[model samples]
Target chain A: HMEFCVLFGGASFEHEISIVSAIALKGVLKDRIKYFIFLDENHHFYLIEESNMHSKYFAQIKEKKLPPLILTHNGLLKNSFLGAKIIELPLVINLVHGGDGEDGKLASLLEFYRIAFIGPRIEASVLSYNKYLTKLYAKDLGIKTLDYVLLNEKNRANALDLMNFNFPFIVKPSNAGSSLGVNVVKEEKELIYALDSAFEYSKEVLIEPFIQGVKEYNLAGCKIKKDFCFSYIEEPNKQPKASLSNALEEQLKENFKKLYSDLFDGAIIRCDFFVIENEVYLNEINPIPGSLANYLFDDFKTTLENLAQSLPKTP
Target chain B: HMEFCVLFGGASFEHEISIVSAIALKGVLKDRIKYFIFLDENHHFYLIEESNMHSKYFAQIKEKKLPPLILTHNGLLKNSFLGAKIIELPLVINLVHGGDGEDGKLASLLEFYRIAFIGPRIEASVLSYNKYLTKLYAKDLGIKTLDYVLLNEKNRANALDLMNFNFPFIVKPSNAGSSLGVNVVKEEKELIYALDSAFEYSKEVLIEPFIQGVKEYNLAGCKIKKDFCFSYIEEPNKQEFLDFKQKYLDFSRNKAPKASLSNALEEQLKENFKKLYSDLFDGAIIRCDFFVIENEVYLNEINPIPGSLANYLFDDFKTTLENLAQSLP
Candidate 1:
């Protein structure tokens, strides 16, 4: 029988949200797969929590003599994951939300030990995580994106010219996800404050002119079993309100079609986008999208369980 | 007590000559250090005559569980050496003469196991083994010698014209040691045949202008016990061709200073030149031979791991090779 290991609770601001997602996934994955839960002391994950999870999970993993938990946190997991000698497990379910992305840590450990793993490889995760580099790659593939500039400690002097962009501008970490470290500056005074706020989360900041006169879209797609499948997009209700339904549909049809074809080899991907002046600017692509985009695919007659089962298993 | 392991015979042309050198070293090293004679089937170094004479002395090394003998020849020692779990031995004395200079294999495995080893790192060996790249680095530092052209399989047609000197060029494998795969091409018809012969040893070939008037000189130096010392300089009897003992002694006494003849730029070039060569000889003992043409000094290839353990012949230098190999980090 194949074994599956799941990690819950993390150090991210979205720790509870990820646990809710993992719990929901674990609920569906229980029947066909034999699995175990590795919860941290503070009841959070490597990406979502602050407490020690390795001490809690280490003994039990060694007792059962199962391969170690695919830890989400860097510091504790670096030691705990590498210390285990067991090699029997078939898959490691990385239920992390943030930190160095969901797939980065697990992918690196798997590579070092020559073990099999799921999702994108380390280079893909690291490359796609940075917004500035992703935009350049996407633009090279003829994808339209909003004009932007990357500001770092060395180039902070140029932030003033970036502030002169029309009325409103958006400032965010060049490598953040789920809208974290994101701020909207409406005035010159707010620009410096927003820039400082962005730097608090990351060293490099990406500043872009607000995509005015547009609708927000969120698209979902997965590369399950090495096959690309796009789900309906959401057209967010712009009553100054974000519509999950509208953004969901538009993201899949318009933005993700190109990204899926470009980053064609991965097992799963989820992207977000914005349309301004009748042109669509691609936002972001996450290999493990929020809760695997369960809501968007629910109406498409596919369950998260079916998608999880369809994932290529380790030999 | 520090355990020192000395490897003698390798599957190279210099294999038999290496064992003679190692057995002589084991005699001098018996008092101060513990040494093991690493033997395998192909090198069959134990069959050498000196090893038979020292059979009683090396009985302790024979009783211990020995490392597995490698089956492949040349550059593949790591696969066999990695079989050992614990090697408390601190330093490795490599007497390997040629073959990809991969005697660095032992050093590589030691580094991975968090143990230090004697000799150069892998990068330096790979770079220095290729004679063409060594010449390029030497020329960049303005170290002078006969003009040469590198002839690759793809550009052999144009290589002949690239050389400023006419027929009677010396062609050799770009990475060979001990004059193997070296031939003098005296005519245009022999160029292809000579290249084909050298190609049997290495893919890259070096074509150098034959120096007609220059005399051959050999100056051996070593990094002994963390100190640099010039071992000795010898002018071959063929170059002297006079009276026997008188010629050998005369050439040895003639200390013509090539470094002193260097101009300001050339002196600076020599300092930088040796520093660049130091990159290939890091923590390892090396012997480099160069020839002087007028005021310029042209470097020959460096031996990452030299033959006869050159330490055996380093009596003229102040320091001992034992201190050099033992002091490595």
Candidate 2:
């Protein structure tokens, strides 16, 4: 029997979102023999029971009711039974959304342990997690992105003077998960407050001219058996100013496919873009998107099946 | 008493060189109480005694006589001595040159275990190890670098057509320690063989135009008490390019230039070094290689963990290393 491990809930600000994604993934892969592993903020791992996978049980988990799980030296997941019982983890499905998990630290550890896992490798994860690197990469490929200034403790005091763009700029941390520290400033008066809030989240903050977009679009890409494929373009809670032409969609698809295969090798990646008058400006890239990004695809189950089948099987 | 663990000898092509570096460092820091840990190619760790720290003992020690060292669940290094005895590793001075150690895998593991160690952090190490990323980083900072083309399995077929520079280009692996798998092809016909050989070391290969220069210079930088300091630039042997053997075996043939640069060049190099140091290096000791062609400085690569700890380069290198250790939080 093939065994799988759905790993999530890492020591990050996106812990709650990861739990929701884990539950959604568990629902999708329920037929398979899978184990749920939670990485708490205290850096301890726990094996959550099937009944406690819900949000109600998450409260008790914080109250210190569950025993911690241990990974043996030989790579077996172990928990207390009559003694210590070893559980074989053939495949580890990493659903961790942010922080150490998304930054490639956890992926590197898994690589060290010789475990077969999903998502991007260590270098790719690190590159995508860093916004500045991603922007540089995009710019190198001739892809359009907002002109921005990178500010740290040394230069953050002159953040307002450094802005070459007009009024109404967006301030955000250089390395942060989700939109936690993202702020839109309409005037110069609120610039300092926004920069201060962004700096609190990360030492380095990125300030860019807010792009007045026609629509916000997200495209998900996945690698299935060396063939790169894209999901349907999704626009959540927004209307498009103009319809996307076939040539533009094809161009975006090819660019994204090349970016994924050349720079990163992963099962899934979600790229966010701002389309303004036929110009597609890359906003950000999520190496590991939430809910396995199942909502973005037309056939979520088939996509999950293809991902599972593409994985190397153990003897 | 303050104790340190000098980590060396990993399962990498640079293993032997790492062993040489370990011996050299052991000789330098022999006055301090330290432990020697060897990570074999199979990822197994072993504790080496002081008596076996020499090159002469390395041959016999490879016969699998030592017991494997284990990192316990509580983050202790323990080896069976009658039963199981815990070994104190207060600090780990990483000397592994390539592969997992230099690429940030070992550093990431050490970080997970909450262990104090020297070297660039995981992200910085990853960036430096990859030649393509390093060039991109340098270019973003408005630093001068050689015009190059990045080739992989996907685009290696049209390697020649992708060349935007003149002939006599250099082909090398995107990620590798030392000068292994580095080749300079004078003619277009030799490009395929060079690319093939370079691809064996790494999946991605970088091809750049060969810069004709007088001497290849190396500058070692370190953080001493919160100040970034650069050592005297040393020009290595005059050759088309430096190889691994020439770098390791013929270390004494190089000459250290005067620790002063032309006024304008000195200010520019200082500014570039500071920008690089603040943005990517994060106070870690990094040795950057460059080609000094006339007044123009072309950046080549960065060595996160320089061999022999790059101690011989700095005048007060020992004091700097001690200060670095003391400043550790």
Candidate 3:
């Protein structure tokens, strides 16, 4: 059966999560995936068999030591009879969720080899991959994100003045993927531990004053054809008892479109938002979100098919 | 004798200029470059033989239609009798300028395939490859640059506001390398023409007020060991859009005079260059163009993977690059 050539796993803190995303997508697009180029921790490509989309299949692949897949100008290849042969491929959906996938490595590789794929381009990679760059990108777009202070090992002291020595704040690794190096500092005593933990994941850390009783909404979508095709927005089960107004919902959708407008033209991305009173602050943009945020869409298979066909063609 | 494997040419407007730089480096490096991988306009790689550094050699390659070179995880390879044999490559110096070369395409390829190279990384590419993002990167570093207005099809009318814009402006494509898409708008009448010309190269265009009689300086350098090694400041006032032959001559320019300027201004320029470079550009040689207006020093542009590797600026080009190669993981 003809299906998507999905790639996942990278040298990311969220490497395991990428596997989960890949496997989940395999289930969603069951019989629709012809190949899964599993990128190992060392960034080697392996042409993996379906094996019913199980996690153990990858573990078994590692134990067995499979021959690494080679990429050619035309398509991915497997060496045989002293020749590298192409695996007649379907259009690739870059399902690698973090690290090299998000950091512009894979995007660059795909573009270099002149391979057809659906994912973030190099500029989009730079914008969404780095937390600090994400802040700057949003700020440039006139989109509102929460105010925060950037901190490093040397400048931890400098941030206190602007922070007003605030407690009950959030400390996160500026460049780390997912919640790997995020900590909630309830008091000044907890701040040092949080910074130390955050630094374990990245060189720089972001310090944001944690707002009490904040409401979070997760919105996922992409641009299809020439216009925006948004998905069903969901309020995460974040222990929020309060609900959002119709006006707030529309505001959130409008901002998602604004953020996605050509910047993330082809990729399906998720933007997490923190709402305070009536104002919505952009929390994060997951460039290749978990399962491509399939849960947010009622008709993911059909939506994704359109997105794959509608990907930006090479110049 | 094996020399170095130099990669050049790409799907860029500066494709011809890249070939010029590659050939020039062959002259400068002088027998140190063993292999030349030519990336044709279509982005196919051809392993070329050394021809005493001639442009016509590449032309022969085009006509002959050589077999495209293949890349492996370990090294570059050539297809053989049913088997693909690996070529023992010396450390690669990415001599390709602009587009896929400087814009993170080749960098990504090399890093992904784990082929050791000396060039700008993805972040550095993102910071310098895009003009608008370059300004943001500099501003965040507290380095001064000329104020610019970014315009696209959506924001073309915003330029008419004349709010941040004034008459006599410099128009350039936001993502273009070199002076590929650029125009000087003398007045409101020329705005449409400039914008139209710039849009040909990139989706977005940048507009900056033209500084009359602006003192321009070119400084090329890299980090060796723990400190910064800066070249003599070059006051190059010639930045007109050049013909193919002109760019070829310009890139191979091996020597230049250290611009005579106030010591204080020079120091400031170096300091700003250091600030802009610092952590971003590792394992890379950069030529930073600057505009020195009186006492003020403004960074004009960073030529990441500069022409001929900015060899003239360094005391020992080959040694410096070899040292940088050693610094890699």
Cα deviation of A161, candidate 3, in Å:
12
Candidate 3 accuracy as TM-score:
0.90
The two-chain DockQ for each candidate, comma-separated, is 0.03, 0.36, 0.55
lDDT of each: 0.54, 0.75, 0.79
Which has the higher lDDT value, candidate number 2 or candidate number 3?
Answer: 3
Residue A83 in model 2: shift from native, Å?
11
Write the candidate numbers in order of decreasing TM-score. 3, 2, 1
Mind giving the per-residue lDDT tens digits that candidate 2 earns over A1-315?
345678888778788899999899778777563678888876667887776789888867768666665544335543332343556575777888877788887777777666777777888887888899889888878888888888888876665565554777789999887788999988778877898899888888998877664567777878878786678777754632324678877767876775686555545888887777667888888888888788777777777667767776442
TM-score of 1: 0.44
Per-residue accuracy of model 1 over B15-111 as CA lDDT, tens digit each:
5555565676667665333444445423322322334535454444345444442211121122223331222444656665564123333333334
For every model in order, the fraction of real contacts preserved is: 0.00, 0.28, 0.62
Better of 1 and 2 by TM-score: 2
Report the Cα lDDT for residue B111, model 2: 74
For all candidates listed, what's the TM-score of chain B alone?
A: 0.70, 0.88, 0.89
C-alpha TM-scores of all predictions? 0.44, 0.90, 0.90
- Name the lDDT value of residue A38 in candidate 1: 46
**Model 3: per-residue Cα lDDT over A11-130, one tens digit each:** 778888888988898878988888888888787788778883577776666667877777777577776447767765667788787678888998888777777777888888888887
